[PDB]
């Protein structure tokens, strides 16, 4: 009878209420006015605030606590970049994230039940096993490529100011890991689309002959090599995930 997305959304909104009530948080309650803070979008790529977060909850945009927390954490990350890692505003934003984490921990079993009702694949043992393997390929093989650090995380526009003018469809290994953690990939095909986007963006930003692109090529190649080594197992997992998906 009960729509678990409604129940989840009410929990998330309550957390937003609690974070809004923390001291000195008003600078985070609504979007930054980028006409008064005239350099804001030259530095920040993914703006976020509590009003936008709440509207997104009400748009039923967060099927689990992961997607919600990712957006909440942008508030902290943006403040660390724009104001500084130890600025009072960054400490204030971190106090909101800390409270969120306390509330999520209090409610973790309830949240897990709602999340699996919304998306039964989150509790499917073949999906979980498939995602586990992908994450290990990323951390033990792809991130182990020498000098692969430029590809481990999203580019910070503060440090590479023209990056997102050139690269409008960015991708990086942390984002892929976040996608794995959310069970975004049900087979290798979608995973390889994101992996190859890293390489394509290197060709575009750094050039096809750049050492950065040679490193990106090595990341892609070790991914192919490892997927091949695990092909028989991965194929069975993919088949069983498909079956579970048809059933859900
Ligand atoms: C532009 C280069 C090459 O293509 C891939 C992305 N690349 C990055 C990525 C990063 C990040 S980061 C610190 N989160 O922004 C993700 C790790 N950083 C710097 C960088 C930053 C400052 N000076 C630099 N000099 C040369 C590179 C460079 N390049």
Swiss-Prot record:
Compartment(s) where it occurs, according to its Swiss-Prot or TrEMBL record: Nucleus
Coiled coil: none
Region described as Interaction with ASF1A and ASF1B: 1-248
Family statement: Belongs to the TAF1 family.
Function recorded in the entry: The TFIID basal transcription factor complex plays a major role in the initiation of RNA polymerase II (Pol II)-dependent transcription. TFIID recognizes and binds promoters with or without a TATA box via its subunit TBP, a TATA-box-binding protein, and promotes assembly of the pre-initiation complex (PIC). The TFIID complex consists of TBP and TBP-associated factors (TAFs), including TAF1, TAF2, TAF3, TAF4, TAF5, TAF6, TAF7, TAF8, TAF9, TAF10, TAF11, TAF12 and TAF13. TAF1 is the largest component and core scaffold of the TFIID complex, involved in nucleating complex assembly.
Associated disorder: Dystonia 3, torsion, X-linked: An X-linked dystonia-parkinsonism disorder. Dystonia is defined by the presence of sustained involuntary muscle contractions, often leading to abnormal postures. DYT3 is characterized by severe progressive torsion dystonia followed by parkinsonism. It has a well-defined pathology of extensive neuronal loss and mosaic gliosis in the striatum (caudate nucleus and putamen) which appears to resemble that in Huntington disease. Intellectual developmental disorder, X-linked, syndromic 33: A syndrome characterized by intellectual deficit, delayed psychomotor development, delayed speech and language, and characteristic facial features.
Protein's name in the database: Transcription initiation factor TFIID subunit 1
Organism per entry: Homo sapiens (Human)
The encoding gene: TAF1
């Amino acid at each position: 009878r009960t729509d678990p997305m409604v129940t989840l959304s009410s929990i998330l909104e309550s957390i937003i209420n609690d974070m809004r009530d923390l001291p000195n948080t008003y600078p985070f309650h609504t979007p930054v006015n980028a006409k008064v803070v005239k350099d804001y979008y030259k530095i920040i790529t993914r703006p976020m605030d509590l009003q936008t977060l709440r509207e997104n909850v009400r748009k039923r945009l967060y099927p689990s606590r992961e997607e919600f927390r990712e957006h909440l954490e942008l508030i902290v990350k943006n403040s660390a970049t724009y104001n500084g890692p130890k600025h009072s505003l960054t400490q204030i934003s971190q106090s909101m994230l800390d409270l969120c984490d306390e509330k999520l921990k209090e409610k973790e079993d309830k949240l897990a039940r709602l999340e699996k009702a919304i998306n039964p694949l989150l509790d499917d043992d073949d999906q979980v096993a498939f995602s586990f393997i992908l994450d290990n390929i990323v951390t033990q093989k792809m991130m182990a490529v020498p000098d692969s650090w430029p590809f481990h995380h999203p580019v910070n526009k503060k440090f590479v100011p023209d990056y997102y003018k050139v690269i409008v469809n960015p991708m990086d290994l942390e984002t892929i890991r976040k996608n794995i953690s959310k069970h975004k990939y049900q087979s290798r095909e979608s995973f390889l689309d994101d992996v190859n986007l890293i390489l394509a963006n290197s060709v575009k930003y750094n050039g096809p002959e750049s050492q950065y692109t040679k490193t990106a090529q090595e990341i892609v190649n070790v991914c192919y090599q490892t997927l091949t080594e695990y092909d028989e197992h991965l194929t069975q997992l993919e088949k069983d995930i498909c079956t579970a998906k048809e059933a859900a």
